[PDB]
Amino acid sequence: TTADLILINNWHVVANVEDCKPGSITTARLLGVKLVLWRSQEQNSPIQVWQDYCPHRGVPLSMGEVANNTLVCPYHGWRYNQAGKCVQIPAHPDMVPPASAQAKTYHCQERYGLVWVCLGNPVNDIPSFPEWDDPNYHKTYTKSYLIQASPFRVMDNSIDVSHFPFIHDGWLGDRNYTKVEDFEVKVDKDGLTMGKYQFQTSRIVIEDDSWVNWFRLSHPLCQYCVSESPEMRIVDLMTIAPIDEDNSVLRMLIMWNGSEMLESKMLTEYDETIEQDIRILHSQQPARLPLLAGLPQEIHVPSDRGTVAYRRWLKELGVTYGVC
Amino acid sequence: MTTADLILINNWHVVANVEDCKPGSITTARLLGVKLVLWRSQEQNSPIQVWQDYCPHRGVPLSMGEVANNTLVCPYHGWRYNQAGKCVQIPAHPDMVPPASAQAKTYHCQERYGLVWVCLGNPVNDIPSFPEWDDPNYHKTYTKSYLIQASPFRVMDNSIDVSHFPFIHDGWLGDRNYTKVEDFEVKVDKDGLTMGKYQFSWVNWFRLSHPLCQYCVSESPEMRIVDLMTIAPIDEDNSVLRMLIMWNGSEMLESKMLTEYDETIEQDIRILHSQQPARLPLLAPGLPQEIHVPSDRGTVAYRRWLKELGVTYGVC
Amino acid sequence: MTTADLILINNWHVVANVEDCKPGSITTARLLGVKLVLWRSQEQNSPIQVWQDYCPHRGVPLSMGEVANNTLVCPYHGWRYNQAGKCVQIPAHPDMVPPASAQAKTYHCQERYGLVWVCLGNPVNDIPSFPEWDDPNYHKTYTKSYLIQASPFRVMDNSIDVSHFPFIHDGWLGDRNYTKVEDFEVKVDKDGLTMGKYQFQTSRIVSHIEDDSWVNWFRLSHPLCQYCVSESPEMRIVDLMTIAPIDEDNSVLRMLIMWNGSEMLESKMLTEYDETIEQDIRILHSQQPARLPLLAPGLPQEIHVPSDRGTVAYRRWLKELGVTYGVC
Ligand code: FES
Ligand code: FES
Ligand code: FES
Ligand SMILES: [Fe+3]
Ligand SMILES: [Fe+3]
Ligand SMILES: [Fe+3]
């Protein structure tokens, strides 16, 4: 579509590396752009991420096939090498393909088992995830969640902490303990950091009903969360793929230093609470996130200081896509 | 799809039947482009609140919450709104007095004839009158609601139209062998529009003081039937039709009367859904202009009335 | 919606097959954003009327009515319209003189090749010619009608294209081992767009295994109809493809197929066309932008190679004709 600079020139997860097998074709959408992801059959072949579009007659390349180290358009069989250049036009086998015959290619990097894509010029680093190679931690990935809400409303809901005892009653919050103690938030050059805050709840992951959480966003659509009890530490990297201004894909990478056998329960806790959030996200109007300044204007109370700082951060960053 | 037409925004409109709103219940409706939430506390005889279905904190519909004591509680962070619409409790800050702006947008609501009437503006006009409501010799019945994909003014146009009876209502209100329409009278003054007696047996007349409500009278030597038809204007292109039917014959006719009304309402809806343009064409304006014959005098009068009232919503 | 393009409004378009308009029948169609009603009286050999599907009294579709004698009767108040579209009876006022405005909007209709052609405007062009129609050497069959969510001009672009045969029609109209496209000529002139004889290699289900060299040729005098001749040393197949432009983004494709060979080939002829038409539709539905891009020195612009000379010439011809509907 018509996204902004902090968005176009940043890295976004569009797939799990396990989604992209050798010789395979898959698709995604990012910032209004249709993407094709493909790999040759070679062992550990790299992933190409291109705009899903043959410039000859406008057919999606994802409808084609991988042949050797090339992607072949189904309509007239033009073949594109790994750099996106047309190397063969079958109707004219002795013709040099015109230089214009080329797919639009994007930057792709595999990191944390996720496929990261930059549609522009990649001036930012991929967000840090310190536990990735820590041998004390195990990992698991949630399924993806397609959410009919603005990506910035999706992240707003993930920075929100006061909703835990209501839509997450029995999982992350306690309807008996609704008060939200004070906490600190700072927005600097490291992005947005929400400081330590304690909340009363036990988790399927029992007398352990005191958890201290904090989180950081260096990237407005990624969040690194740390949730700690005396017994265990759980971290997660949530990535929100902005399909367009009104639709999102949520993925979460979870790591924990307890027993590896907790994996099933971890995925259940996250699945339950994600779907609880999605019920609210789908209902919110207007769909795009209102920035600080028909329907009434938003109201803020002190426990909204982090979601207020997020709206302020988005404005300073110059975000206009998916917001209002 | 909202309106500034005063005759619409400053008027009363039926949005529900009172039996639909039990104590402790939450229901939804739409009126003139606005999403409404209707709720009652669980105490007996509790009043009906009708609000814009929206929490001003983070934009969640209040209808997704729950009724607790005398309050409607938003599901997202549990802000509690009392029957007057004021937020009385913000659970994250139990000792804080909520901001003055933590307020639901509330609308006027009145129960009359067993229906829930709502005014979204200033209630300048009054609810249409219905004399037989106070008459112990008349039984009453309510049709189900009918959702119609047509402009509410085209819906009312079809109810003022009387020459179609022998065609789409053949066998029920008309007879294909008697198609000629005899002369009848219609006047528009500032009591509204009033169809003079006519007959296709049954002698009928009707009047509208409200452009989307109709009071019909149908009389025979045996008995007389009155109905109050109300057309809820959801937006410019969608309507909810209800009828309140009263009659002074045997009460056991109810099942048949409901069937006769159901048959002919559905015959009308088949026409209403097909008509183009969707908005009602007013007089003197790639589709040709309307044609009028003498038996259209009532629907012509209706188009003239709507122009004098200044209607622009759902009309062209 | 509608178009002011004269080449489209003042031209003839197929909207139905004559077999779907029985005496006494009412059917519907849509053409260039206009809703049509097609009807016939019960009489033997009655003509087909094609009118705007609209009663000017209160705006009801006349197609919801019924045919009575030689009139179409609106269901709402029973106004009766004769074959010329004039209202002859207003039942509420049986003695009145119906106003001149009580008249359906009527269009030009003409049955040819067993198809119903309609002109919404002033017919300055003729229905395209299909010489084999009157040849008793030739058998005929009609495909079913295919609703396609693509611009009618993209649908025709795909039918002018020949280099795609060995790919999406591999095993039917081409061979993945013979993908080179021989040279051929194209002309845009008084006749419209003509692709000269083009030889390609394939065996086909409608002929013998060794009959594996075919020669195609086609002419469009009308930008949404195509007369195509496909010939081998063993058989000659001709077809008249017609694309009904429902609106800018939706089309109805019909094909009338004739061949000079055994009448028993009919089932195989319909199988081949159905299989290849559906392969073409899979591509058509995927193409973006939806409207056909014209020539012009967001999405990257089209590239053209020499075997595109016919589809390039088509884009040039459409601009020369003044087409703006369904093109970009
Ligand atoms: S459209 Fe891709 S090769 Fe022609
Ligand atoms: S959205 Fe209603 S309490 Fe926060
Ligand atoms: S709308 Fe056709 S006769 Fe009245
Ligand atoms: Fe949550
Ligand atoms: Fe009726
Ligand atoms: Fe084809």
Numbering used by the authors:
A (entry chain A): 2 to 206, 209 to 296, 304 to 334
B (entry chain C): 1 to 200, 213 to 297, 304 to 334
C (entry chain B): 1 to 297, 304 to 334
Paper text:
In this work, we focus on two cyanobacterial Rieske oxygenases, SxtT and GxtA, that are involved in the biosynthesis of paralytic shellfish toxins (PSTs). Recently, we demonstrated that SxtT and GxtA are responsible for complementary site- and stereoselective C–H hydroxylation reactions on the PST scaffold. In a single monomer, the Rieske cluster and the mononuclear iron site are located nearly 45 Å apart, a distance that is too far to permit intra-subunit electron transfer. As observed in other Rieske oxygenases, the monomeric subunits of SxtT and GxtA arrange into an α3 trimeric architecture to facilitate inter-subunit electron transfer from the Rieske cluster to the non-heme iron center.
We discovered that SxtT operates on a number of tricyclic substrates, preferring β-saxitoxinol (β-STOH, 1), to install the C12 α-hydroxyl group, generating the potent natural product, saxitoxin (STX, 2). The crystal structure of SxtT was determined to 1.86 Å resolution using a modified model of dicamba monooxygenase for molecular replacement (SxtT and dicamba monooxygenase share 31-percent sequence identity with one another). In SxtT, these positions correspond to Met and Thr residues, whereas in GxtA, they correlate with Tyr and Val residues, respectively. However, in one subunit of both the ligand-free SxtT and GxtA structures, the loop is ordered and can be visualized. In SxtT, this loop folds in and reaches toward the active site pocket, whereas in GxtA, this loop adopts an extended conformation on the surface of the protein. An equivalent tunnel in SxtT does not exist due to the orientation of the loop, which closes off the active site cavity.
